[PDB]
Symmetry: C3
Subunit: 138 residues, 3 copies
């Protein structure tokens, strides 16, 4: 039994008037790593001007040749308020992420999250999320 999730759309905005992340450390010129970025990525349930906010991706990603992410996917949805998905994995725009756990309605969750670039804007981009999660809450 797989959780029937809709495709989510993460707004990754590094700069601009709607910037939702910030770098707190920089990369060492000798090694080429070390940059840490704290992010509060907004996550919508769809595309378009009437898409509503349903979750936040609150955490950080560090650059060590590739970006290693660690964030809580906390749901602002009315029915799923409080429940979170715990995500850890490599790369922001493409690749996969691991569902290492969850809380509330998604307690003891496990699965993966597929990422796909959908739109590149001037100060950010939108990343499509496909969640293949499983919950033994039964």
């Amino acid at each position: 039994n797989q959780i029937n999730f809709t495709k989510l759309y993460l707004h990754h905005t590094p700069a601009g008037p709607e910037q939702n992340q910030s770098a707190v450390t920089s990369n060492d010129k000798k090694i080429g790593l070390g940059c840490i970025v704290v992010n509060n990525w907004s996550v919508y349930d769809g595309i378009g001007s009437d898409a509503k906010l349903v979750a936040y991706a609150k955490g950080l990603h560090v650059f060590a040749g590739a970006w290693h992410n660690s964030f809580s996917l906390v749901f602002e949805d009315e029915r799923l308020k409080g429940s979170t998905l715990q995500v850890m994995g490599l790369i922001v725009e493409e690749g996969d992420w691991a569902i290492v756990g969850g809380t509330g309605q998604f307690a003891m969750a496990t699965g993966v999250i597929l990422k796909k670039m959908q739109e590149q804007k001037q100060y950010g981009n939108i990343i499509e999320l496909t969640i293949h999660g499983f919950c033994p809450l039964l």
Copy 2:
């Protein structure tokens, strides 16, 4: 290197562990301060502060309580506090066994048990947070551990 793959089965509801009446001392200030911020929030964005924590965990409230574990890790502010730490136990019967914890919010809410080592290998579950006592230099947070350990 060598990678072996063996088909088998996983007993999800193998060993159920339930720890009640655990109290974490979250002390951001004072002489007993057990954490420190190493970055500050970006004044334009409103986030970025990273705090490294070594929270002590006791088996009760009062003077008869004894330290049983340390919450060693970090928590970063991105509108709320996202945690990530190893709950390493220090008592005799559980020395070495750790619980890997991730989740939002420190004072309340729920934390996710994403793994463990030693006696808590492959552990999954949740940790319930509840405000127990507010103090001058911080607060005591009651923890309620509900999880499972697969046996395989």
Copy 3:
């Protein structure tokens, strides 16, 4: 019960190089002298299939470790070999040069991986050390 596969890695050798011309990590924050914690190091540890000059690089440990009395780790173990290219193992735990690590997830060929990673000191060098990794994990079928 859940049908799956028990994955067992042996003889993986991680290069932990804090200094030298092959340094593969860098501290970004310092320890707070008042409390005794706060040092954050971002690490890109190389993992090889053996010891010696004939060893091939098979994976990277990309993440970070913070000091709070001990070293709390969080990183992705992404493999570089052709068969496992892109697949990762999500790892969290305490101590770098010894002890146990926990497998909290995985992607690609190791989706929903759960288990532990054992560490053991092998070679102590002037600029770093080499840690042998033994992985005992489980992945559910598909």
